[PDB]
Design a protein around this ligand. Structure first.
Ligand SMILES: [Zn+2]
Lengths: 191, 287, 51, 286
């Protein structure tokens, strides 16, 4: 079918730890990842979904595999404790997608941020023009709590779909602990 | 047609993979694949070899498990570089090299896809230094045997250089398969970095070798060297006698002085000259 | 287990290459196996008398 | 804890072939792979290897990748073809000890406890043995950091095996200065061994480059050994070390005087066995 490789970047930072969302923040984002990796598998059997983090230690928790049983086994007692480090989060997200079996796939990443970021906006726009010369489209979806009216992420997606990119979006977080299934119902319906 | 100058270029890495897999599981006939880079009508090049696991107890070539190779063919494909299977091998343990009737059938299943898959036999037992026992083969059609026609249409004086063994000539050579002359692809990227790394003595000759016992060993030889010279004070005395060609047959029971007596002199020299010199370089260098 | 092939043991060989495949226990020579336990006779000391 | 390592020439060649198949990238790539083998009787053995896909961007050089699915199934195959063979650690191509090799080791210590690395050579030129290995040790100790960890080199050599010495000595065919007599030792350790001590003397000169000008950490634990080398420097020539030296020269050369005296009479006897075949042959044959 259409050639992509869906790569989710899960959020094991230390601000996603409370119990304001109804089951858990961890389980509600997990089953959201489950129904969208069921969305990317059943529309195209070639796509595999592994998970990466953007914490202090950007670990390959589960390897990029079409199995999800390792994903389901590690996300139980996953210990989401760590200072968020998004300035290395692009480089772990981009260089992973060059380690793939096919470079003819559409480079697509989703990114979950539920913690206050301490990046430089000048450093990301150097990474944004780095991604301009690398032709990468990433739809970042905001979870949890953050600086409201998300700071430095509007200017990054704007400098992501620049130079005739014009296809990316920025799904921001509503600061109310509602059920997050309908929150992500917009990327599963259209891009 | 073929010009009997087929000249199989192989490798430097595969031969070590061939002998290690052929020696560790020796008395059962083991096998594997040949993952090389195919070239023109004349030659063929096999650079990589991966080994295939067995099936059960018993000397056989049993069958290939295409579950294993299909996952293996795309294993290193995603990591290194693409290659293509150009042949296969097995290992006669202590025989030599031929195609048995069991060996020929699994060959004939492999020549169906490509007409140039090479059957390779290695023998990791009759090999010592300058012998690596080899001579890969390939089938000939038995259809041409009924015609009485001699194949392979010799256009160069390059094929009939090696002479086949008579034990392989008992088998299907030359009625079902043929030999192929091979050489080896060596290069300085590998040649120097295995020569200068194998036997390098570190600081051994800058020692004194057990200084009370070296002069003790300098009598452990000399004492029986006296009586071995008494034999040399004996065997020369029964000459001008029965025609010393007779002194060649007759001296196979008991020991002779003359060879044994020039033996220890080499031992009592290199043990002394090396140890006396190394003592006198330590005095200068160490203060 | 090359340490276990004591001089005296009974082993199995290969036919073709003639190498050792497997150590074996002792043999029990079926004349003696058919000498050991082929009697189901069930007579007792009650049947003997007089001695 | 580990005595020494034993490296076979298979795995030595099983890196350089991989360095050639990635040598087409041109710009920069280090060969990092998985090292397979055992260790028995406290001696580290190295038998087999392969290489894992790996990339590295120069800006923010703390982002590495090991495709562990490629690490799982290929070791799953190699355990299946050889249950005796197992993991022993890892390796990298090691020109100059790149920076990721402090936590590559900590990434994959969940397979081997003493996950040893191996530094190899791709451009062979030295007067020694260009195969390096370290070990992982950590310390809550003296001065540097609350979390401190630095590699320590364990001794390294190329071990042999009976099956591979057939193939190793077959692939050379170039030069092999065998026939160990009175002059094998003269060159393997008397020409070369004195120049062996050259680069060991010259190595502490390279540390000595910091007298007032070099790098900022100064000594603390480097000079207790260097204070001892000049202290344990050997005994001077005043004692009977003079006299007991001439004692053994007057003992070792006696055996040389006897043995050389023997060699003359032996070859003199061999002259007589050649005059028995000259004068007693010309009258008979002609
Ligand atoms: Zn065979």
């Amino acid at each position: 079918m259409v050639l992509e490789s869906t790569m989710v970047c899960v959020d094991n930072s230390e601000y996603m730890r409370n119990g304001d969302f109804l089951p858990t923040r961890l389980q509600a984002q997990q089953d959201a990842v489950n129904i969208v990796c069921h969305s990317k598998t059943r529309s195209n059997p070639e796509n595999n979904v592994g998970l990466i983090t953007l914490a202090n230690d950007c670990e390959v928790l589960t390897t990029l595999t079409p199995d999800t049983g390792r994903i389901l086994s590690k996300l139980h007692t996953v210990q989401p404790k760590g200072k968020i480090t998004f300035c290395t989060g692009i480089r772990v997200a981009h260089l992973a997608l060059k380690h793939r079996q096919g470079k003819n796939h559409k480079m697509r990443i989703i990114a979950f941020v539920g913690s206050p970021v301490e990046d430089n906006e000048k450093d990301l726009v150097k990474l944004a023009k780095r991604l301009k010369k690398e032709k990468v489209n990433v739809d970042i979806i905001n979870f949890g709590e953050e600086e409201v009216n998300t700071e430095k992420l509007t200017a990054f997606v704007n400098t992501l779909n620049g130079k005739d990119g014009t296809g990316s979006h920025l799904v921001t977080v509503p600061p109310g602990p509602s059920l997050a299934d309908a929150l992500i119902s917009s990327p599963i319906l259209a891009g | 047609a073929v010009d009997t100058a087929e000249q199989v270029y192989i490798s430097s890495l595969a031969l070590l993979k061939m002998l290690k897999h052929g020696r560790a599981g020796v008395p059962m006939e083991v096998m594997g694949l040949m993952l090389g880079e195919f070239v023109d009508d004349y030659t063929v090049r096999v650079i990589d070899v991966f080994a295939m696991p067995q099936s059960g107890t018993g000397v056989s070539v049993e069958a290939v498990d295409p579950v294993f190779q299909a996952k293996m063919l795309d294993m290193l494909k995603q990591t290194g570089r693409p290659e293509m299977v150009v042949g296969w091998y097995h290992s006669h343990p202590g025989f030599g090299c031929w195609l048995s009737g069991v060996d020929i059938n699994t060959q004939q299943s492999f020549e169906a896809l490509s007409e140039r898959a090479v059957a390779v036999v290695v023998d990791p037992i009759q090999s010592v230094k300058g012998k690596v026992v080899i001579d890969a083969f390939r089938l000939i059609n038995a259809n041409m045997m009924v015609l009485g026609h001699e194949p392979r249409q010799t256009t160069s004086n390059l094929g009939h250089l090696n002479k086949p063994s008579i034990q392989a000539l008992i088998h299907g050579l030359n009625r079902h398969y043929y030999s192929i002359t091979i050489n080896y692809r060596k290069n300085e990227l590998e040649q120097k970095m295995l020569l200068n790394l194998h036997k390098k003595s570190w600081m051994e000759g800058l020692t004194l070798q057990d200084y009370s016992e070296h002069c003790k060993h300098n009598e452990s030889v000399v004492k029986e060297m006296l009586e071995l010279a008494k034999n040399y004070n004996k065997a020369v005395e029964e000459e001008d006698k029965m025609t010393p060609e007779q002194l060649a047959i007759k001296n196979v029971g008991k020991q002779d002085p003359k060879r044994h007596l020039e033996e220890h002199v080499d031992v009592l020299m290199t043990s002394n000259i090396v140890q006396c010199l190394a003592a006198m370089l330590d005095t200068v260098v160490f203060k | 287990d090359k340490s276990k092939l004591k001089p005296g043991t009974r082993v199995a060989l290969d036919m073709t290459t003639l190498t050792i495949m497997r150590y074996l226990p002792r043999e029990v020579d079926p004349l003696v196996y058919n000498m050991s336990h082929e009697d189901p006779g069930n007579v007792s000391y009650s049947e003997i008398g007089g001695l | 804890a580990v005595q020494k390592v034993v490296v076979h020439p298979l795995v030595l060649l099983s890196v350089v072939d991989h360095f050639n198949r990635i040598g087409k990238v041109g710009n920069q790539k280090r060969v990092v792979g998985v090292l397979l083998g055992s260790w028995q009787k406290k001696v580290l053995d190295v038998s087999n290897s392969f290489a894992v896909p790996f990339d590295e961007d120069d800006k923010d050089d703390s982002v590495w990748f090991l495709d562990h699915d490629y690490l799982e199934n290929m070791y799953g195959m190699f355990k299946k073809v050889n249950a005796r063979e197992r993991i022993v650690g890892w390796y990298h191509t090691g020109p100059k000890l790149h920076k990721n090799d402090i936590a590559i080791n900590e990434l994959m210590k969940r397979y081997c406890p003493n996950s040893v690395l191996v530094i190899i050579d791709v451009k062979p030129k030295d007067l020694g043995l260009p195969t390096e290995a370290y070990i992982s040790v950590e310390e809550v100790h003296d001065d540097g950091t609350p979390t401190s960890k630095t590699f320590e080199h364990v001794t390294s050599e190329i071990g042999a095996e009976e099956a591979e010495e057939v193939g190793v000595e077959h692939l050379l065919r170039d030069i092999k200065d065998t026939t160990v007599g009175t002059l094998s030792q003269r060159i393997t350790n008397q020409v070369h061994g004195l120049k062996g001590l050259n680069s060991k003397l010259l190595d502490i000169r390279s540390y000595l480059e910091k007298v007032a000008t070099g790098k900022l950490p100064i000594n603390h634990q480097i000079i207790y050994q260097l204070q001892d080398v000049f202290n344990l420097l050997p005994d001077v020539s005043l004692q009977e070390f003079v006299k007991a030296f001439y004692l053994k020269t007057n003992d070792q050369m006696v055996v040389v005087y006897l043995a050389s005296l023997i060699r003359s009479v032996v070859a003199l006897h061999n002259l007589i066995n050649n005059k028995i075949a000259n004068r007693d042959a010309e009258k008979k044959e002609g």
